[PDB]
Ligand SMILES: [Ca+2]
Ligand SMILES: [Ca+2]
C-alpha cells in the first residue's frame with residue numbers, strides 16, 4: 001500500500017482503522033489490563049502511524065524491497081527476510097519494548113509489523129508481482145490511495161468474545177499462529193490479484209479488489225493488535241520451552257564516522273556441551289553500513305536445543321583487506337521463538353580480527 005514518511009496515507013489509514021475497529025468490537029468481558037494497554041496504544045497513535053509507513057522510506061531498505069513480499073503458497077550463512085518473517089521480528093521487538101514501559105518505541109515497532117502485514121494483504125505483494133513486472137503494481141496502489149476513505153471499515157463483523165477474535169488467542173505459539181493467520185489473508189490477496197486486481201481486469205474489478213483487500217487489511221490488523229494487547233497484558237511468552245530452530249539477530253550499527261564495516265562478519269554460539277556453530281552475516285544488500293539496522297536469521301544444525309543450552313554468543317570480524325577496518329555496533333538483540341533473549345548495548349569498537357562476546 002502507499003504511505004508517506006510523515007505517517008499518513010493508506011498504510012496509516014489501515015492501522016488507525018485497526019485500532020478503531022478494535023475499540024468497537026471489544027466485548028464487555030475483556031480484562032482491564034487489555035483496556036488500559038489499549039489506552040496506552042492510543043496515546044501513541046503517532047508512532048503507530050509512523051511505523052506503519054516507515055519501512056518504505058527506510059534508508060537501509062533492500063534495493064527492490066524484497067522483504068515487503070511473501071508468496072503464501074511457495075547453516076553457514078544467514079537467511080533472507082520475507083513479509084511474513086518481518087511481521088514476526090517486529091512483533092517480538094514490540095512486545096519486548098512494551099514489557100519495559102518503552103511504549104513509544106514499542107508502538108513504532110508494532111506499526112512496522114503492521115506495514116508488512118498490510119503489504120502481504122495487497123494483491124500484488126503475495127503474488128510477487130513487482131513494479132518491474134507490471135504497470136499495475138503502482139497503478140493499483142495509487143488507485144487505492146486516492147480512494148482510501150471509501151474503503152474504511154469500523155468493525156471486523158463480530159465482538160471480541162466471538163469466533164474471529166477468540167480463535168486469535170487459542171494458540172500460545174505466536175509465531176506459528178501469525179504465520180498461518182497471515183497466510184490466510186495473503187492467499188485471499190493473491191487470489192484477488194488473478195481474479196480482479198491485475199492489468200488484465202477492469203476498473204470495476206479494481207474497485208472490488210481494493211474494497212476487499214483494504215477491508216481485510218484493516219480487519220487483520222485489528223486482530224494482530226488484539227493479539228498484541230493480550231500478549232503484553234498477560235506477559236505471554238511464546239518461546240517457553242520450545243526448541244530453538246533458528247535465531248534472529250537485530251543489529252544497530254552506530255552512526256559515528258566509519259562505524260560501519262565491509263570486513264567479514266560472523267555470528268556464533270557455543271552450547272553447554274561445548275559445541276559451536278558460526279554463520280557468516282551477509283545479506284543481499286550492503287550490510288553493516290554506518291547507522292543502519294540489519295537483520296540476520298541463522299538456522300541451527302542441532303534442532304533439539306533449548307535457549308538455556310546456548311551458553312555463549314559472539315560476533316567476530318575478519319579483515320577483508322590488509323588493512324583491518326573497525327566496526328562499532330551500538331546494540332544487538334537476539335530473538336528466539338518470538339522472544340528477545342539478548343539485548344546488549346555495545347557502543348565500542350571491534351578493531352581488526354577481534355571477537356566480541358554478547359553472552
Ligand atoms: Ca554478499
Ligand atoms: Ca558497505
Ligand SMILES: [Zn+2]
Nearest residue numbers: 001002011119
Ligand atoms: Zn505498502
